[PDB]
Amino acid sequence: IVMTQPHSVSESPGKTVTISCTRSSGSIASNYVQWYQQRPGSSPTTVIYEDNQRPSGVPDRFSGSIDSSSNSASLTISGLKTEDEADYYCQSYDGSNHNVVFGGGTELTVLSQPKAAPSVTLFPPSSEELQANKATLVCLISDFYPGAVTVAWKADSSPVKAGVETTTPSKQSNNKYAASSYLSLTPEQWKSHRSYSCQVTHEGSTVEKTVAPTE
Amino acid sequence: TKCTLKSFTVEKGIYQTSNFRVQPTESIVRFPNITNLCPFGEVFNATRFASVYAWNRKRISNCVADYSVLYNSASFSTFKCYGVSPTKLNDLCFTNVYADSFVIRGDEVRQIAPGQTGKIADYNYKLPDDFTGCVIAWNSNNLDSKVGGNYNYLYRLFRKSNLKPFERDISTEIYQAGSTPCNGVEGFNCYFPLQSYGFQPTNGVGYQPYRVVVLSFELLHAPATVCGPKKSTNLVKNKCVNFNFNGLTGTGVLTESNKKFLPFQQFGRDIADTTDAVRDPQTLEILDITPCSFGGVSVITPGTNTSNQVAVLYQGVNCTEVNVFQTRAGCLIGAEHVNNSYECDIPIGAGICASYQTSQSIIA
Amino acid sequence: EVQLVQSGGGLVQPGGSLRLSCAASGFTFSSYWMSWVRQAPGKGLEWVANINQDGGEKYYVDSVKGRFTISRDNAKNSLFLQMNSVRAEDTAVYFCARVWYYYGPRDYWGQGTLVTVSSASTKGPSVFPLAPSSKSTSGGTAALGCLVKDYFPEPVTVSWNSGALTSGVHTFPAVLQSSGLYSLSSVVTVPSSSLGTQTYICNVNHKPSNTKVDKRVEPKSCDKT
Ligand SMILES: *[C@@H]1O[C@H](CO)[C@@H](O)[C@H](O)[C@H]1NC(C)=O
Ligand SMILES: *[C@@H]1O[C@H](CO)[C@@H](O)[C@H](O)[C@H]1NC(C)=O
Ligand SMILES: *[C@@H]1O[C@H](CO)[C@@H](O)[C@H](O)[C@H]1NC(C)=O
């Protein structure tokens, strides 16, 4: 048994966009459906429980219904503003073996920053770190609103992807991100490739920049 | 005093100004032990049921239906209500409770709901639109795993007439496909209105004993006969409070007394037909009742011509529930007690008089 | 009115475990159920286990069945969760929340316990600058930063000259490589006018160790700019 839930969703302040939560086995009208909200950096809180009703304190804009068509649920979150941009989870008691199954989460955000193309900035290794065999590859990009960073790596002759790992972006001052990438290197195999290009197709250009391994 | 006398210059004497009264601070609610519990235990784990369509009805009478055992257990599987709010069932009183119960399988739990009709909409017990109640269906595969697949809860199927809300589909009429009636045993397009059970434990997960006890509610003009228990607060003494006993309701202090009531005697009354004693509902202790301190306020002034300082005299009140000097007629606040005896100038009561002498201050 | 707190662990290791204690106060801790829910970093929520009123039943999940022991003392109004033989996938933040009723949600949650498993204990790491020379002096947004690798805890707050050469720093968290390798790096914007004027000196703020060594960066001003 698992609770399906969309990964991310984004829009502008305006009409409402409901969040779906489809079950996998059993019936949805056999138990209650709750919706929790977890603020980044604090403890979760209950917003709506027993979707046919709503508790006090929370404004009546947060509404939800029950869809018994394919054992799913909907949370019609109305009034999209800045104080509602957070994460939400799904929960419904289904396990007959005394198990509480939870959802996957969401990334409901807003739209306030304009569209901008991220710059391609590749950083070559240095000499102080290159004592015997040690270096890194920094292709940090900036000036981009969407957090779905999609970059690539190629040493001018092959899309090297061994040990691919990206850096988690952080919230900048004016609602920006600093997503980077960190690909694994070759300590004793620096003479195999004398160039390293960093390609990026994060909704924009595709210009690649080359560097030198050790000079 | 000047406002009550409607003047600016008053003479010597004691004048009545107002009438003060102490207000109750808090309230105390006392109810006896919660006895006479409703026999809801024999509804879930008891002998087998009669049949599916031949479900038995168990009405409810004057009792104490505690809900702290329904939504606080784990033996059940489904607890989906339809506008009942079990969190507030302890503060809601009903009059008609329908304790319907029958036997179904795991796949038939979905078909029994006001929002999902079908096989159980015209062939077995049907649910109304409102249906103020919660469905209670648990997996009964604990000991209902007998061999052979005993088919005794034969449910009637393929019935023409639709089933009415809160009724049974008892009709011994063979299934006719639209031809002449056979009037026999599976004759010309005939089928007996019975279906064979036998969901053995080695048959499947969906085919298991899932005895469901349907519970609903209904309000009528009759007085509330079935309702949940009530709450009770902590006992407080020696304070002007507002007691809220089972049969008594009023204000006054609640102190201890040496009176002894009879086993059946509960209340307490004086000669003037006034309540003066109450018995504790929870424990066995006679609590005395006494009205809180009241009375008028009087001032003792030596005249605005001589001076302007005055005193107050709360008549009939103790000096604890209000310099201060307990007299035989109240608490004269604002005067000193001198042992020297002089002529009475301003009468106060019980021989005590006041005067403006020597540094100048009101003496008593 | 209900304000729950929990503590009793800052760092664990394989084999050696501890016992989490959730102090119950404010409300009446005699008519409500209790259950633990953990949250993995970058994941959702997972139901750990449940517990009865005082000693009725202790329901566990099939994942941790056999290596977790839950308890609850109704007398002192406390909830104890003792662990044993901590696995590798148990790296998650645990939350304490009371259960209103067995078929309902949780009213008040706890505060979170940072319980993580990581080898490669406290040691002396090194910092290495970026030295942007090849295609970053004039192509794109010119910037530069530092790099802190192979450091066990996370107390580092990378600054520039202790607040003397700051022009806008956007520091992002690090990430675990295999089991104990964390690669932290900072970045600061430069108007591309003082690359060969003032030499940059990055400083580390490691609390356990003393990473006060400012590694000199070598701007290759003769190659491109
Ligand atoms: C039957 O079920 C009730 C649930 O209210 C439970 O309290 C009781 O222990 C069970 N067993 C008997 C023999 O009543
Ligand atoms: C039942 O009544 C007795 C009589 O004093 C009292 O001591 C006891 O506390 C009562 N039971 C409960 C559960 O309050
Ligand atoms: C007034 O209250 C005090 C304080 O308990 C008490 O001792 C006294 O008997 C009461 N009555 C009078 C007339 O003082």
Strand content of chain B: 15-25%
Return the structural class of chain C.
Answer: mainly beta
Indicate the overall shape of chain C: elongated
Helix content of chain C: under 10%
Bound molecules: 2-acetamido-2-deoxy-beta-D-glucopyranose
Order of H and E elements of chain C:
EEEEEEEEEEEEEEE
**Helix content bin of chain B:** under 10%
Task: Provide the gyration radius of chain C in Å.
Answer: 24 Å
> What distance separates the N and C termini of chain B?
21 Å
The CATH architecture category of the domain at 3-116 in chain C equals Sandwich
Number of strands of chain C: 15
Q: Strand order within the widest sheet of chain C?
A: 1-2-6-5
Order of helices and strands of chain B: HEEEEEHEEEEEEEEEEEEEEE
CATH level 4 superfamily of the domain at 3-116 in chain C? Immunoglobulins
Strand order of the largest sheet of chain B: 2-11-12-14-13
Largest interface: A-C, 56 and 57 residues
Structural classification of chain B: mainly beta
User: Into which percentage range does the β-strand content of chain C fall?
Assistant: 25-35%
Task: Give the CATH class of the domain at 3-116 in chain C.
Answer: Mainly Beta
Largest sheet of chain C: 4 strands, antiparallel
Question: Helix segment count of chain B?
Answer: 2
Protein name (chain B): Spike protein S1
Region (Disordered) (chain B): 21-37, 157-192, 221-243
Region (Immunodominant HLA epitope recognized by the CD8+) (chain B): 150-158
Domain BetaCoV S1-CTD (chain B): 36-229
